[PDB]
Amino acid sequence: FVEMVDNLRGKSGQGYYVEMTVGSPPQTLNILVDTGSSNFAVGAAPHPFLHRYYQRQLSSTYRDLRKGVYVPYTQGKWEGELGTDLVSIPHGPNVTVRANIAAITESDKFFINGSNWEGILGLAYAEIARPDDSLEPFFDSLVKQTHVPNLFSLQLCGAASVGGSMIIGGIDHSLYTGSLWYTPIRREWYYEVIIVRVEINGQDLKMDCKEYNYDKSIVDSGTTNLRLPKKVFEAAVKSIKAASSTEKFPDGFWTPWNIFPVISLYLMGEVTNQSFRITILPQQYLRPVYKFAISQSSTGTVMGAVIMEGFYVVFDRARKRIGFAVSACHVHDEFRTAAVEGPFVTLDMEDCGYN
Numbered sequence: 570f571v572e573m574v575d576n577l578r579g580k581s582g583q584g585y586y587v588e589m590t591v592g593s594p595p596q597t598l599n600i601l602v603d604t605g606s607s608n609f610a611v612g613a614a615p616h617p618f619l620h621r622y623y624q625r626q627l628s629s630t631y632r633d634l635r636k637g638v639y640v641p642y643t644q645g646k647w648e649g650e651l652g653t654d655l656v657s658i659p660h661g662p663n664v665t666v667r668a669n670i671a672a673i674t675e676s677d678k679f680f681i682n683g684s685n686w687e688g689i690l691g692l693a694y695a696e697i698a699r700p701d702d703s704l705e706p707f708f709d710s711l712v713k714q715t716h717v718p719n720l721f722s723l724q725l726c727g728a729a730s731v732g733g734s735m736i737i738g739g740i741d742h743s744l745y746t747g748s749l750w751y752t753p754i755r756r757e758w759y760y761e762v763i764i765v766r767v768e769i770n771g772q773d774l775k776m777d778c779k780e781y782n783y784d785k786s787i788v789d790s791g792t793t794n795l796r797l798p799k800k801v802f803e804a805a806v807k808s809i810k811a812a813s814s815t816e817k818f819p820d821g822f823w824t825p826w827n828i829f830p831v832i833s834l835y836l837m838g839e840v841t842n843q844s845f846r847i848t849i850l851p852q853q854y855l856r857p858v859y860k861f862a863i864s865q866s867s868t869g870t871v872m873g874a875v876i877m878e879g880f881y882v883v884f885d886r887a888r889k890r891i892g893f894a895v896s897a898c899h900v901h902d903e904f905r906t907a908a909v910e911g912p913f914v915t916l917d918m919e920d921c922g923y924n
């Protein structure tokens with residue numbers, strides 16, 4: 570999959586994007602890779618922040634669906650006009666597919682002033698597509714229309730320019746060390762997973778595990794931070810504060826690598842009563858602006874770039890599971906390294922999920 574290695578770019582905190590083409594003749598656009606949503610949407614009008622935009626008038630293969638659409642994310646939102654067109658990924662598989670495309674015609678706090686992307690590729694499932702689950706997401710269209718296998722993987726590498734790889738249809742073994750460990754996708758909407766235990770410096774947070782997944786835990790390449798439910802964030806911060814008593818930092822805030830604690834999330838494994846743990850280092854959760862990149866949520870745990878930059882993450886849709894392995898590009902020192910380890914014995918893991 571050599572041609573797909575290093576096909577991701579971005580600036581820190583502004584997301585990771587891949588080059589795509591849309592229309593005939595092909596119009597090149599940079600498109601955010603977002604496992605936390607399910608719509609393919611591109612700027613279609615001359616917003617002043619945009620380097621370029623989709624011009625439907627130039628495409629002979631454009632088809633109008635004569636239907637509006639609107640997607641609000643955590644912070645921004647857009648509305649637009651649904652249609653279909655031919656799409657490919659220059660540094661992806663050698664194929665062209667007819668996909669649904671939302672042409673964005675109005676937006677608020679969505680495009681970023683100074684960013685180098687013009688659209689978003691929602692890689693999650695139909696259940697959360699707008700306006701409804703009948704709007705087939707891109708990856709579903711790709712798998713339907715080609716022989717591309719039903720999985721993709723992400724190696725997000727970080728550094729204020731960032732880089733990475735999206736391997737569509739497979740796994741590049743040179744991008745990770747050790748073994749992949751798989752956690753089940755609990756339900757196909759977001760990439761929802763179940764966290765069964767949390768350790769700060771190998772010390773259990775000792776919370777009811779249901780709190781870790783209240784109301785969701787998801788894997789989201791579109792989110793920068795590791796986001797934790799407040800009751801879990803509260804307990805997480807408390808322990809991180811204690812762990813790091815050598816120095817004091819102000820309340821609002823919430824290089825000496827060895828002073829900061831590693832954080833371990835234990836994830837439901839593939840077998841009854843079996844889990845595994847992923848562990849990140851301070852170099853993952855201390856990101857240059859350093860800013861502390863763990864935050865509160867009312868919408869559950871979001872394993873964003875802070876988690877994903879430690880690991881090669883395989884979205885094995887075919888088998889309804891997500892794989893984690895230590896990333897071959899992750900930043901580490903002579904002392905410590907990000908880790909994926911197992912098996913562990915964990916009882917009542919099905920009770921950790923919220924209903």
Ligand SMILES: CCc1ccc2c(c1)[C@@H](NC[C@@H](O)[C@@H]1Cc3cccc(c3)CCCCn3cc(ccc3=O)C(=O)N1)CC1(CCC1)O2
Pocket residue numbers: 582583584585601603604605606607640641642643644645679689697785787789791792793794868869871
């Ligand atoms: C289906 C639409 C939708 C609606 C709500 C929503 C989500 C998705 C979940 N995923 C959010 C993710 O899709 C978006 C994508 C995005 C949108 C605009 C810009 C960018 C990314 C790039 C910049 C990344 C910075 N950043 C983006 C988001 C959140 C935090 C954050 O730091 C964001 O909304 N990401 C994340 C959650 C579900 C749990 C919280 O909320």
